[PDB]
Amino acid sequence: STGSATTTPIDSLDDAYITPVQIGTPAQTLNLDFDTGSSDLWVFSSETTASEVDGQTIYTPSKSTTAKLLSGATWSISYGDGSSSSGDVYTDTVSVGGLTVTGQAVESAKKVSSSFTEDSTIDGLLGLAFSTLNTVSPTQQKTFFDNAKASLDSPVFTADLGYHAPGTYNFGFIDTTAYTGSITYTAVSTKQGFWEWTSTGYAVGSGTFKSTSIDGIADTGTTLLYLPATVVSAYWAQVSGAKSSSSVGGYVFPCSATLPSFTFGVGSARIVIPGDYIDFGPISTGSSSCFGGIQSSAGIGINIFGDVALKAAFVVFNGATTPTLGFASK
């Protein structure tokens, strides 16, 4: 089997991407944030504290003839950005772009933190990291991908995120029309439950390539590119007037600037992030200070190849017995 679904930016900055997901019988379509950095499929629901729902579409398990309470199961998750959610668990039928999993754990939120409430466009998350990170207790549950894997034509999914435009998540096949040149594959460590890999280096603008190993995670659920302070300083040094602002929470730059590109290495291959992809706009409405899309990972504890990086590539998440990651230009 295969599936193919369009993923759409939630706003004009590409702060996140939403993908429609069918849950239950009859189908209830929710728009979920596909997140290769976590492993829970959770939704706003009829069980979510009413004051914490503000415009989201909710899953109502009592209206699904295939929903079953997973007795005694609870979940609770905290994300890198400080947001969180928790609740109980149903199993139900879940379909993405024509690919159907029966018996998928659907984690129903009883509580969500303010950042979730405040984002009316995201109805929940669909985790695509390794199932070892799933938070359901006392019986850990599998991700949608893990459940689908054996049925797929090939045990892979691909992320093709757009810049200020829709893109595609495919399951079970590689669309050879969706990228240019060849796909370069690179090793993955699953030791921390992430799609963790090692970039071979970077360049800033038209500058020379610096060969250096940068361990990090391919994370569709993180907006920005978070890299070591040395790398980030070298980038922003090429932008007149750019500076790190403790008050704002990272590097800012004059909105009048033209940003240089940033290149990262995948083996001997190179992925070029255009400068415009690094512009996250005014820090507040009407400001001439703009927020940067490349930020320091210092104090995160891990480097994160988030959407800024991934949207410059066609990315293969190969879930073979020994997982790997592939990157192609597009």
Q: What is the token pair recorded at 292?
A: 């940067």
User: To what resolution in angstroms was this structure determined?
Assistant: 1.2
Active-site residue 35, yes or no? yes
C-alpha distances (whole Å) from 65 to each of 90, 126, 222, 292 are 12, 22, 35, 47
Q: 199, 261, 296, 297: which one is catalytic?
A: 199
User: Which letter does DSSP use for residue 214 in this model?
Assistant: E
CA dihedral 172, 85, 295, 10 (to 10 degrees): 60
- Would you call 174 helix, strand, or coil by DSSP? coil
Q: 35, 40, 88, 219: which one is catalytic?
A: 35
Where, residue-wise, is CATH 2.40.70.10 in the chain? Answer: 5-174, 175-330
User: Which letter does DSSP use for residue 260 in this model?
Assistant: P
Active-site residue 54, yes or no? no
Tokens 């207790």 correspond to 137
User: Which letter does DSSP use for residue 75 in this model?
Assistant: E
Contact 214, 228 (CB under 8 A): yes
CATH homologous superfamily for the domain 5-174? Acid Proteases (2.40.70.10)
Contact 232, 253 (CB under 8 A): no
- Alpha-carbon span 143 to 145, nearest angstrom: 5
User: Which letter does DSSP use for residue 45 in this model?
Assistant: B
Q: How was this structure determined?
A: X-ray
Contact 14, 22 (CB under 8 A): no
- Alpha-carbon span 213 to 278, nearest angstrom: 22
CATH homologous superfamily for the domain 175-330? Acid Proteases (2.40.70.10)
